[PDB]
């Protein structure tokens, strides 16, 4: 099933690691413009989702049936793909050829019920897991080669999505450059219903604030609505009359 | 922040940065620098300056 919601003002999170103090630091980087259409993908029991510069991801189930991401150009065994699992105890990563199963599934836990061989698979990385009422956000980008993950936790209200700021600081990163052009996510699994919102990412420009602490407290999307523009222009968050 | 390390300024330059080893947050300052003005009287009366 698929519907459309506001995006709001979500989807900020640190462009570096440079510490500022009691700034208005203006940005030119990729983001998710304000008010924007994001995917409802809600009660899916069992699609492509196409990869671009950037994506957007949230979700806020308790089930856990939900985990893991794959990423690749054709997901075939002609092609290069970086499989990522983010499963209890670590993560598993690695750029592998196959034809993969019927369906990528965990099958709860054989992870050979996504992959169905291998190829020359040099690389391999095992790290820390991700995992570790309740609101998670993530933030999936690749530049340059690089792989980027930005992510949250908050504590949600309800199960609809809530208004509000939080910026999401980063927590990994990966010298690993393929071809990905697709991305689909994982399902470990008897009906059952998920849900979760996909956004996509733009090169905009952006006005952030930062405390006398260093954390991000506030932003302005430039070329939303005129007084966007103004308080771009002006560099402050309050405009006298004129 | 925890995951910080440098500093900046109003506009370009480091101004604070961590101790790789340590824990530790200290500053960054350039060293001294200035103009020299010298004070005399005329030739005429001394060459003491
Ligand atoms: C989303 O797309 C619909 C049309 O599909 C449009 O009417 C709407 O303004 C767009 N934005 C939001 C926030 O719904
Ligand atoms: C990468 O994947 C795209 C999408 O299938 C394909 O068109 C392209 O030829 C592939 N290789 C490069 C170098 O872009
Ligand atoms: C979870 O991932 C770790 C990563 O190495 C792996 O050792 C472990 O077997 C995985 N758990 C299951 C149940 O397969
Ligand atoms: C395996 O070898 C082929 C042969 O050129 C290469 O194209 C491919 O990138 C290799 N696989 C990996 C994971 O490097
Ligand atoms: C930053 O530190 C100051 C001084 O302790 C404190 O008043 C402020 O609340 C802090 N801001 C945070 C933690 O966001």
Redesign the pocket.
Known sequence: TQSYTNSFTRGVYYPDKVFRSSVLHLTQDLFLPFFSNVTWFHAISGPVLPFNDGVYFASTEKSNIIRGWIFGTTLDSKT?SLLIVNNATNVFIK???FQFCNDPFLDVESESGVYSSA?????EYVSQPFLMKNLREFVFKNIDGYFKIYSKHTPIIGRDFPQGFSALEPLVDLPIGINITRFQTLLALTAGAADYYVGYLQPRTFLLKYNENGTITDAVDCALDPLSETKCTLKSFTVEKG | LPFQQFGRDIVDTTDAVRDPQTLEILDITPCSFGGVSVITPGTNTSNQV
């Open positions: 290069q750029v592998c050829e190829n020359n698979c040099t690389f």
